[PDB]
């Protein structure tokens, strides 16, 4: 059983646990033992949670960022149910009271003993919130559906819990010996070397002498750096770059000068290098695992003796010892930097949220100054979440700064954590050591919230094919599995389904090139009807949303789309869920989805920020999740079609039109007869404004009818981008056919069109006020290595699009010019 769990973890993470042992790495060994203990302690705490607390762990509340409605309620094991009329302002407890009173009269004879389950879902309604604060209830109101809920007793919840159990003296200049290499190229070879603290250099870079490409090259020369050994900061990074010249990049490699035990490193080191696109300080500090083919560089760190980095007590001991200040404190010159450092005590006392700027002006290549910074840091007041997100960036590489950022981030709600989880996982790629505060923070939150654990796992699992993170991410996942053996098995079931979908999709790719679609579709179904497929594809939690249950696969309704990669369309049904159980997922394999996944998350964030200000633009933040190498799932939006399909203006249809411009409007009329047409045009108008502003801010062009879809409700959404941040300055885009629907099919309708302009302006001004949040998240995403999110010019695009330099009046003026130009562009 102990053996079995190891084999199950190995299969789940895609890497045998035996491979960790074979490295013979003390840091790996210590990480595994320490974090296993940490995660098993979390498990012990979880298994003794009270039933309400377990609900909060397993089914965390999905809330939104008077009026009457019908609700159907039943009891766990019963066919019979009661339809109640309640108010939107009523609490769950009031609803549960009604249910128990009805049961008492039917059975002929305590609300606090119950929770309301959403039928056929792992989602619950509970707590002191009015019904309309829950996302499920709001979803039902907007779609006009009846909520269906099930009374679940505390003893049933506890049964779920139970079944799911488990130094300063060294003044000489820092130097190294470059011994030799082992490589392939066409010229002479040169090794550039630099000391870095994050992005900034600790001193000038030093080059090696030119040697012929011959060999297996040899140098055996000392490289001496312009910085004392006592002045090396704790997180000092020695970076190398091999290239050829008569420029031709070949390889690079980094390492930390101190090890994970705070000891200065000696002596000889073999650096297995990574291939280049000269210095790359943000690159990983672990060697290339492919030692067969990787070019190596052997070096010698001199035995200066055993020296450790000074402890915090010694650090603090050493350290213990105006209008224009404000005018610059909202890139700065030499005298301005000195002003800030001079008045660093005043920054702590009066301007604590300017810590970042203070950290950027401190001299990290002088230990007394670094010291002087850390004493202020250790009594620095906790900062808001927004400030802490900036501090996670690689520009702030110091470990005490990192620890301070995490300390300020502990007040993140689970909802905020979920929202920023993609970025936080990517920040792990900047980390220097395995055991770190970010990893412990994420694991802790993941074990305290099953939904966070679900998405943490998949973000990590989806990058196990990347050699530079496979070890780190594999270890984190192993640790998590030690924390929840039950959830490990739940995730294995998802993995087994995805394995079958990959095999099925490979068949479809081959088959689609050899026969007709009806024939490929029929053989797809025959493959799915195999017992191994029916079993593997049925009865699992959706990777897109663990609260969504994918029960019985509806083979007859499964198909594939015509796009190059032939993405699979998989439909499900659930008797217990009813119509809400009718859900679809798309499996797509062969394309890099990461950039589009980022775009969708950012649109999702925009939607939350708008709703927080009482602006609902009726967006469609459909689920999207990377699951493996160029593989991911997409949540199907049902009852929708492409603008292209509708604009074909097919005959013998309700949408058929006298002019092509009326095709969209006629389609909406057919789906929304009578008085319902007005709401659909509004839903269309609102969503159009949302996506117009979203694509403008994110710099998304290439917008055509094949990549835009419309729901029968009228809601417009996008299914391909991407292509963002001006990576084909993209203008604001207004399409004539959409303007036509907004104007109710009329040629002149300023009333409706200017309302639409108002929505766009309100949406735009709200995003400007959270401009810094976007900049900080995108900064952290530079860790991901996306082709179109590589440098400062990509970040600069957002500053320009949100006009953060300008005042609100100037920015709004500037936005109105872009809107008007887009209006003129429309025919
Ligand atoms: C009725 C109907 O077809 N409803 C639909 N709803 C959705 C949500 C559809 C959809 C389909 C596909 C093939 C994709 C997307 C969305 C988004 N997207 C990428 C940009 C993301 C993976 C990164 C796709 O590849 S199709």
Curated annotation (Swiss-Prot):
Pathway the protein acts in: Phospholipid metabolism; phosphatidylinositol phosphate biosynthesis
Protein name per Swiss-Prot or TrEMBL: Phosphatidylinositol 4,5-bisphosphate 3-kinase catalytic subunit delta isoform
Pfam families: PI3_PI4_kinase, PI3K_C2, PI3K_p85B, PI3K_rbd, PI3Ka
Tissue specificity field: Abundantly expressed in adult mouse spleen as well as in testis. Isoform 1 is expressed in spleen and lung (at protein level). Isoform 1 is expressed predominantly in leukocytes.
Residues annotated as domain PIK helical: 320-483
Family: Belongs to the PI3/PI4-kinase family.
Broad enzyme group: transferase
Protein source organism: Mus musculus (Mouse)
Gene Ontology molecular function: 1-phosphatidylinositol-3-kinase activity; 1-phosphatidylinositol-4,5-bisphosphate 3-kinase activity; ATP binding
Segments for region (G-loop): 560-566
Annotated C2 PI3K-type domain residues: 170-302
């Amino acid at each position: 059983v102990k053996k079995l769990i190891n084999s199950q973890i190995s299969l789940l993470i895609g890497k045998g646990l035996h491979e960790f042992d074979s490295l013979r790495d003390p840091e790996v060994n210590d990480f595994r033992t320490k974090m296993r203990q940490f995660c098993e302690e979390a498990a012990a705490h979880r298994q003794q949670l009270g039933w309400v607390e377990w609900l909060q762990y397993s089914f965390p509340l999905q809330l939104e960022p008077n009026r009457a409605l019908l609700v159907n309620v039943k009891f766990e094991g019963s066919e019979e149910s009661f339809t109640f009329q309640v108010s939107t302002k009523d609490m769950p407890l009031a609803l549960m009271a009604c249910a128990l009173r009805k049961k008492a009269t039917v059975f002929r004879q305590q609300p606090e003993e119950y929770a309301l389950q959403v039928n056929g879902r792992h989602e619950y309604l509970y707590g002191n919130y009015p019904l309309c604060h829950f996302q499920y209830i709001c979803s039902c109101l907007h779609s006009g559906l009846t909520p269906h809920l099930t009374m679940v007793h505390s003893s049933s919840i506890l049964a779920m819990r139970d079944e799911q159990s488990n130094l300063w003296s060294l003044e000489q200049p820092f130097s190294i010996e470059l011994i030799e290499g082992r490589k392939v190229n066409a010229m002479k070879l040169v090794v550039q070397a630099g000391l870095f603290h994050g992005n900034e250099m600790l001193c000038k870079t030093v080059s090696s002498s030119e040697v012929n490409v011959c060999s297996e090259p040899v140098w055996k020369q000392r490289l001496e750096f312009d910085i004392s050994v006592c002045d090396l900061p704790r997180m000092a990074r020695l970076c190398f770059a091999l290239y050829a010249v008569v420029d031709c990049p070949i390889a690079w490699a980094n390492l930390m000068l101190f090890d994970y035990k705070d000891q200065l490193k000696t002596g000889e080191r073999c650096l297995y290098m990574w291939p280049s696109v000269l210095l790359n300080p943000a690159g990983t500090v672990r060697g290339n695992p492919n030692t067969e083919s990787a070019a190596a560089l052997v070096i010698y760190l001199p035995e200066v003796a055993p020296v450790y980095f000074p402890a915090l007590e010694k650090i603090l001991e050493l350290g213990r010892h105006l209008q224009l200040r404000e005018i610059l404190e909202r890139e700065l010159y030499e005298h301005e930097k000195d002003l800030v450092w001079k008045m660093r005590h005043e920054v702590q006392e009066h301007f604590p949220e300017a810590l970042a700027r203070l950290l950027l002006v401190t001299k990290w290549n002088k230990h007394e100054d670094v010291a002087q910074m850390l004493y202020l840091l250790c009594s620095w007041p906790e900062l808001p979440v927004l400030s802490a997100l900036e501090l996670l960036d690689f520009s702030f590489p110091d470990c005490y700064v990192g620890s301070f950022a995490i300390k300020s981030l502990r007040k993140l709600t689970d909802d905020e954590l979920f929202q920023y989880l993609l970025q936080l996982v990517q920040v792990l790629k900047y980390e220097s050591y395995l055991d770190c505060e970010l990893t412990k923070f994420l694991l802790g939150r993941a074990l305290a919230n099953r939904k966070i654990g679900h998405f943490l796992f998949w973000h990590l699992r989806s990058e196990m094919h990347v050699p530079s993170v496979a070890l780190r991410f594999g270890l984190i996942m192993e640790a998590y599995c030690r924390g929840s053996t039950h959830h490990m098995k739940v995730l294995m079931k998802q993995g087994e389904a995805l394995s079958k979908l990959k095999a099925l999709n490979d068949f479809v790719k081959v088959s689609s090139q050899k026969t007709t679609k009806p024939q490929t579709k029929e053989m797809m179904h025959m493959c799915m009807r195999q017992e191994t497929y029916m079993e593997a594809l049925s009865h699992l939690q959706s990777p897109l949303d663990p609260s969504t249950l994918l029960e019985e696969v509806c083979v007859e309704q499964c198909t594939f789309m015509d796009s190059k990669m032939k993405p699979l369309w998989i439909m499900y049904s659930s008797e217990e869920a009813g119509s809400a159980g009718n859900v679809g997922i798309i499996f797509k394999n062969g394309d890099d989805l990461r950039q589009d996944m980022l775009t969708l998350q950012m649109i999702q964030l925009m939607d939350v920020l708008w709703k927080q200000e009482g602006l609902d633009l009726r967006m469609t933040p459909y689920g999207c999740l990377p699951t493996g190498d160029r593989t991911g799932l997409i949540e199907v939006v049902l009852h929708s079609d492409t603008i292209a399909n509708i604009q074909l203006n097919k005959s013998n249809m309700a949408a058929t039109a006298a002019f092509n411009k009326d095709a969209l409007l006629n389609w909406l009329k057919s789906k929304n007869p009578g008085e319902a047409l007005d709401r659909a045009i509004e839903e269309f108008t609102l969503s159009c404004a949302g996506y117009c502003v979203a694509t403008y801010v994110l710099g998304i062009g290439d917008r055509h009818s094949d990549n835009i879809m419309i729901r029968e409700s009228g809601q417009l959404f996008h299914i391909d981008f991407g292509h963002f941040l001006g990576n084909f300055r993209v203008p604001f885009i207004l399409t004539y056919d959409f303007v036509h629907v907004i104007q109710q099919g009329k040629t002149n309708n300023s009333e409706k069109f200017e309302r639409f302009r108002g929505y766009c302006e309100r949406a735009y001004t709200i995003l400007r006020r959270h401009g810094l949040l976007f900049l900080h998240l995108f900064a952290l995403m530079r860790a991901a290595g996306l082709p179109e999110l590589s440098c400062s010019k990509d970040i600069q695009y957002l500053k320009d699009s949100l006009a953060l330099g300008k005042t609100e009046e100037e920015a709004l003026k500037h936005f109105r010019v872009k809107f008007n130009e887009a209006l003129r562009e429309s025919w």
